[PDB]
Ligand binder design. Structure first.
Ligand SMILES: Nc1ncnc2c1ncn2[C@@H]1O[C@H](COP(=O)(O)OP(=O)(O)NP(=O)(O)O)[C@@H](O)[C@H]1O
Ligand SMILES: Nc1ncnc2c1ncn2[C@@H]1O[C@H](COP(=O)(O)OP(=O)(O)NP(=O)(O)O)[C@@H](O)[C@H]1O
Lengths: 513, 513
């Protein structure tokens, strides 16, 4: 047969990419267009949904043009998969085919007041009142509370609700809508699981929660898997159907963190990914039975390949300041210049010789939520240097993950098998070594590090027959793309000390209000 | 009709210096020679006593040579005075007239074992057991514990003790011994008050503590005042007796901190000096009534002019040094390249806005005396920078200073009349304002930088009749030597709040064991 290609629209918080993968899972064309960060009031953050749709359309047609200018075997795209910034919610009109306002973004805080009242009035004071249904606490992040807000603050949304023309959708839904020309109103299980309106046991909308949160079920889209036929591209927005040439099905849709889980081949229970970005998002595949957290971690859907196919659940945790902490050492403190120095300076001392740097600049998250904790350094001597503090910052990041994984292992009732990693801070080799040493497991670093875009492409290519099974997807990956594997190295003495010191230091972190 | 000159050997921790003053209290010739800082184990510090005695003679001979280039009618020096690093203890045989071993320095920690036997075998847990007699807690600093250490551990020392020839002496005693050529074996009240073998009140040796610590009294020298004939300079070490021309009396001797007190005209009760150096120290004159301390501070002789004229008394607090902390920020952490920036960045922000930095790199000294405290920063956010940390580091020195002064008020039963502050950091103007505001007093900065050396020269001058009274001394000073002065410019709102941050930050510093 001939060369096969699968496309991935990667719609992030600050930009959109399109990446074309070949049948070997190589990224062979890519383009990136940013979209505007609108902030009307402090704490508020909005995206223009038409700009987002247009950006993806541009990325598609540029990346396609560049591919066919440099690859004479590239005939067409077999299917498109989509991955997205989760929780971000769009409100649009079923007849104008267009938004009634900008989209409040995942980390937007305008829903704070609604969050206090849902916990008080429906929760009886308990923000975990629906956690056995949603997998989620009452939080500003989740989609329903942004839907709620738009009805209470945007006349045109509240209007359109009345007339029976209102569509609420996460970015997966909105994109597949405008890509379709309005023919598809779908969402995948992983995105659906971030709304506070889905039931994890059924993977279906919860009539109760919709009712108690006063969100009409007609406004919501239909829940499907991550990998199956969602529709077709049928739009000439930036000559995207001209670029695609032939009729191209949308056969993949997955929320970004879940997409990184899937693109890192975390298919068996006990496999986990961490994205070392500005913050950290760790997801572990906990197997086919959902698992709930006694430590405030989120339960969510990992993935689901095929309509009503096996559905693997996951647990999810975050640290807020990973790459941010590295950046803070460079800009705010002058501890180094080019980002390659961070690791070189940290390597130049064999340990931290007593100091702990807890970088809780915007609170502690993980399994010890404490928004009063601030950034704090303890134990410094006249022998302490920037080298020591940099290494300690890296130790910190690895220690939080270790605490985060500890919670997951007890909640899930299983062990960590290995940790696949990506992001950017995963290029820091010494961090990766400290992380493996603390965890006692091998850390796998894929060299093709476009894993978030890849997850979406695998879903699409699976559904389209490009790859025929999860075991073939792993084989193609091992055969074609390299994986640097980082084994634990240190000692039980060093590890216990570091964790003991960590535990003490956390007791000194409280400071705010 | 023809100008009289007075010499001053300033024998410091890292170097020895000779300053010749004239009748105007102006330094007219100076010369410096450093000596070796021996560190044979971690925590230990010792000095070669002959290297010190030689440094001193070299300083005298060069200083004299230069002075007679400037004033070719300079026949002779009226008298010499001595000021020295206190507690540093030398052991020497009285017939070889040479040291039995190197001299353990004030801040040497080798006596930590012997110091603990004393706090249990006599102190019964309470270190402060001889407090009413000596002024001082049981600490590793004081001469007795080092005289003991050398007897228990250095063959030739305990040899010469059994042979009836072992002299002990502080650096004053050692300098006056060797300047005499063996003829004089004396010490002054201020140095004596650091031995842990003298009654603060009476200023004579205590046979109780001598017998209880098993230092024979034969080994100790004759206590005298700070201002009287002690001896003559008879040695030839670097032609020093030739260079003096006439025979030259040693008429002055005073420990360095007291010499800084006496050289900044702190004659009235309530007057106080802050000295920046190897160690950093605040001393306050508390009048002729000897005052004792609950709050950890030391009680010591301030000064005593003449064969029992009035003896003044003082309280003493060790700070953390501004210099070390500033230098640590500079060359350990890279927060600024040159010292001009340290102040600019500190000024560049309005306040610390949340953060505290307790620069207790080897323990809280001051009134809290906690050896478990380490260097701590609390309350950081992403909006925190080198500037805020540098300002916080400066606040913390003022706050340590305040707690010491607040402590001095409760124990003396008086207040800070005014504060004098020359040293490594009086070229930092922002620290001075912050200091003056928290303490609510005037900060006198003398522009003659040789004020510690001036102290011993004033004593020697009073005895030899270059000056007649403290009035003349004061009068010449205000006439010849200027001082810039820095006023308070804060309030209780900023003060009492800035202390509240501080007092709460102190609680999270604990970190040893
Ligand atoms: N080669 C490198 N070595 C070590 N650290 C790096 C390197 N490159 C980047 N970093 C740091 O790691 C972070 C990686 O960020 P990156 O993931 O590329 O972008 P981002 O904006 O954080 N996207 P996200 O992962 O979605 O949060 C940066 O914030 C840097 O501080
Ligand atoms: N105003 C003065 N009256 C008498 N002698 C002086 C005076 N000023 C300087 N001398 C003498 O001049 C010689 C050189 O001293 P030197 O310090 O170099 O003078 P200067 O350059 O004016 N500095 P200063 O001592 O601060 O006045 C010494 O012998 C001083 O005693």
């Amino acid at each position: 047969f001939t060369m096969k290609y699968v496309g991935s629209i990667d719609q992030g918080t600050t930009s959109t990419r399109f990446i074309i993968f070949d049948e070997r899972q190589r990224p062979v064309s890519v383009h990136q267009v940013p979209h505007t960060q609108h902030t009307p009031h402090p704490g508020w953050l909005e995206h223009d949904p038409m700009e987002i749709f247009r950006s993806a359309c541009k990325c598609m047609s540029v990346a396609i043009a560049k591919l066919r200018q440099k690859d004479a075997s590239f005939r067409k795209i077999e299917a498109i998969g989509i991955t997205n910034q989760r929780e971000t919610t769009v409100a649009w009109d079923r007849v104008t085919k267009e938004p009634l306002c900008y989209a409040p973004v995942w980390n937007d805080l305008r829903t704070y007041d609604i969050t206090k009242k849902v916990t008080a009035e429906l929760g009886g004071g308990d923000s975990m009142f629906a956690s056995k249904i949603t997998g989620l606490p009452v939080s500003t992040y989740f989609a329903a509370f942004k839907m709620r807000w738009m009805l209470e603050n945007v006349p045109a949304v509240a209007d359109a609700c009345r007339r029976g023309t209102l569509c609420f959708g996460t970015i997966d839904t909105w994109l597949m809508y405008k890509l379709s020309g309005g023919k598809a109103f779908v969402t995948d299980v992983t995105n659906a699981s971030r709304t506070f309106l889905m039931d994890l046991r059924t993977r279906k909308w919860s009539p109760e929660l919709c009712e108690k949160l006063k969100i009409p079920m007609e406004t919501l889209p239909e829940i499907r898997s991550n990998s199956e036929l969602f529709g077709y591209v049928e739009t000439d927005e930036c000559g995207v159907a001209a670029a695609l040439n032939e009729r191209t099905p949308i056969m993949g849709s997955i929320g970004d963190q879940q997409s990184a889980l899937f693109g890192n081949m975390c298919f068996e229970k006990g496999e986990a990914k961490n994205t070392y970005g500005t913050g950290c998002f760790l997801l572990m595949n906990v197997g086919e039975e959902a698992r709930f957290s006694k430590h405030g971690l989120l339960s969510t859907v990992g993935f689901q390949v095929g309509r009503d196919g096996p559905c693997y659940y996951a647990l999810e945790g975050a640290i807020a300041c990973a790459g941010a902490t590295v950046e803070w050492m460079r800009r705010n403190m002058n501890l180094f210049s080019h980002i390659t120095e961070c690791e070189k300076l940290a390597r130049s001392v064999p340990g931290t010789q007593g100091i702990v740097f807890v970088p809780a600049f915007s609170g502690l998250l993980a399994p010890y939520w404490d928004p009063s904790a601030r950034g704090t350094i303890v134990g410094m001597t006249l022998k302490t240097t920037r080298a020591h503090v940099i290494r300690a910052a890296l130790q910190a990041i690895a220690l939080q993950l270790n605490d985060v994984v500890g919670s997951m292992k007890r909640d899930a009732g299983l062990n960590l098998s290995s940790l696949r990693v990506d992001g950017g801070l995963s290029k820091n080799g010494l961090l990766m070594e400290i992380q493996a040493s603390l965890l006692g497991v091998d850390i796998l670093v894929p060299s093709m590090h476009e894993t978030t875009a890849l997850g979406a492409a695998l879903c699409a290519g699976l559904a389209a027959g490009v790859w025929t099974s999860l075991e073939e997807v792993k084989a193609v990956s091992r055969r074609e793309n390299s994986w640097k594997t980082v084994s634990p190295s240190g000692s039980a003495m060093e590890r216990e000390a570091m964790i003991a010191e960590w535990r003490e230091a956390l007791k000194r972190t409280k400071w705010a209000k």
